């Protein structure tokens, strides 16, 4: 069934599962034509497929050439997402295949179910959580590899860096969703928070800065402030 606040700890048990977010698969800029009509220009996109227990991120880069000559691209994007997720599952050894795939948008349910008919025992589930994975393209290293791609490519990351050496996967996911929610609500401010102090750097093999335990508590507090504010600045409260 659907994944919600009530069954949240299920994400961190030992049954392999993946979140799939398709919100950055089909990306466009909207512009005027010489004749004054409007047109779109696609830019490279990505499927965000994340194991929330381990942090493993399978970032499938969607190169704009996949849309060439195709119609109804927003519908096709859901099916292309499901095709790529099914291909990923088939590429993994049996003992690494997920028992459940949780889609962040309900419109992905039928495309993924149809593509996964060969895997009757993999449950395809929606969620009632409003997860902020669309903000993944605000992580500089992820945006950079997507924008530089000249062909379809899969790139593997650990979205938790080395956090699991010191914190649990529940705590790591909570930090990740807080950071992403902040980046989604006010990207400029969130990024200022994360980089303001130049003595804290991002390792070459990491996505986020090398904060101490104490600095993460401060950072996390700054992100919560940002989110509540914007929630005021927005609703005036």
């Amino acid at each position: 069934g659907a994944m919600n606040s009530s069954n949240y700890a299920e994400l961190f048990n030992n049954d392999i599962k993946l979140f799939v977010d398709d919100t950055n698969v089909y990306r466009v800029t909207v512009h005027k034509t010489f004749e004054g009509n409007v047109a779109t220009k696609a830019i490279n996109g990505c499927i965000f497929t994340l194991n929330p227990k381990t942090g493993h991120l399978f970032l499938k880069i969607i190169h704009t050439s996949v849309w060439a000559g195709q119609k109804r691209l927003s519908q096709l994007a859901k099916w292309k997402t499901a095709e790529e997720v099914s291909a990923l599952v088939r590429s993994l050894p049996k003992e690494e295949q997920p028992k459940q795939i949780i889609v962040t948008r309900k419109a992905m349910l039928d495309p993924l179910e149809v593509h996964m008919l060969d895997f009757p025992n993999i449950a395809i589930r929606p969620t009632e959580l409003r997860l902020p994975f669309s903000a993944a393209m605000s992580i500089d290293k992820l945006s950079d590899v997507v924008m530089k791609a000249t062909e379809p490519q899969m790139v593997l990351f650990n979205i938790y860096d080395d956090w699991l050496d010191r914190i649990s996967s529940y705590t790591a996911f909570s930090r990740l969703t807080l950071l992403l929610r902040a980046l989604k609500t006010n990207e400029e401010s969130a990024k200022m928070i994360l980089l303001s102090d130049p003595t804290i750097t991002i390792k070459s093999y990491h996505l986020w800065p090398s904060f101490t335990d104490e600095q993460w508590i401060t950072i996390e507090s700054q992100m919560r402030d940002l989110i509540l504010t914007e929630y005021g600045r927005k609703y005036n409260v």
Binding site: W79, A82, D110, P111, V114, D118
Partner: protein
């Protein structure tokens, strides 16, 4: 003109014969139904006055045998039976005819309703959906489940309709996932028509039989089958033109005959709105769309 005689009517019952019905009182001198048109299947059906639970009945074709009804006080129902002795049966029917103890099948000469509802329905196909090979007629009731319902429990008492499932390997060619899901023409024309049903007449026959079981017995799984068979055609971009024209006629007469007060439970809002307004065939069912809009605009 054929006759379905009755040994007696010991319990008060509403008896249906095709789209007609009449009330029979407990121990009323009723001895059956005469003047039944030859050339069609027929259904004789029953609802007891004391237990409107379980509508039940029998599909038959009088060309296949001499059939009669006798109430069984042990099993508590009117049972159809076959009399192998033709002279004895003709003699009994003649005696009852002379004593005017039979109702006449009350067909209006201008009226093609029953033909139109059973055009493609064949007794041999009914007997494959309802498996009871020792009898030439077929029992159906309100509670019988379908093979597909059982998969999701007694197999001998099941309705063996052709399983249709839009999210199944049968329906979806590997590598054509999006194409086959959004345009079901492959599944309709190759899998179902060429492969399973063999021709559109057999497909329409099963569609018509499912509707009739839904209408006359409130059989829920039959309603599901009827709607699935409609949706499979409407969700196919490529359908033979003669099938679309025939489907429009089939559905028109089904909607025309449906009791106005049963539309709430026997019509699926999603399927009908999709079929008439969103599907590939939204502009191909003119007669059905017109009768639906004038008789059940609320559903739409």
């Amino acid at each position: 003109m054929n006759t379905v005689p009755f040994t007696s009517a010991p319990i008060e019952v509403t008896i249906g014969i095709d789209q007609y019905s009449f009330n029979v009182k407990e121990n009323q001198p009723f001895h059956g139904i005469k003047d039944i048109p030859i050339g069609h299947v027929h259904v004789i059906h029953f609802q007891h006055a004391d237990n409107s639970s379980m509508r039940y009945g029998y599909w038959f074709d009088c060309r296949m045998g001499n059939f009669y009804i006798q109430y069984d006080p042990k099993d508590g129902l009117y049972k159809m039976m076959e009399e192998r002795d033709g002279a004895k049966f003709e003699n009994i029917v003649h005696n009852f005819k002379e004593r005017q103890m039979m109702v006449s099948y009350p067909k209006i000469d201008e009226d093609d309703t029953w033909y139109n509802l059973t055009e493609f329905v064949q007794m041999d196909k009914i007997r494959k959906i309802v498996r009871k090979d020792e009898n030439q007629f077929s029992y159906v009731d309100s509670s019988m489940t379908t093979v597909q319902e059982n998969e999701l429990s007694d197999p001998a008492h099941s309705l063996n309709y052709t399983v249709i499932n839009f999210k199944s390997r049968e329906a979806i060619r590997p590598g054509h996932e999006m194409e086959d899901f959004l345009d079901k023409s492959y599944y309709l024309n190759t899998v179902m028509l060429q492969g399973i049903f063999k021709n559109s007449s057999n497909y329409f026959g099963e569609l018509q039989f499912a509707f009739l079981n839904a209408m006359f017995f409130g059989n829920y799984g039959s309603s599901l089958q009827w709607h699935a068979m409609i949706e499979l055609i409407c969700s196919s971009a490529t359908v033979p033109k003669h099938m679309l024209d025939k489907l429009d006629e089939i559905l028109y007469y089904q909607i025309k005959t449906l009791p106005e007060q049963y539309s709430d439970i026997l019509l699926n809002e999603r399927v009908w709105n999709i079929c008439l307004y969103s599907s590939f065939q939204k502009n191909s069912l003119h007669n059905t769309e017109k009768i639906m809009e004038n008789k059940y605009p609320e559903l739409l």
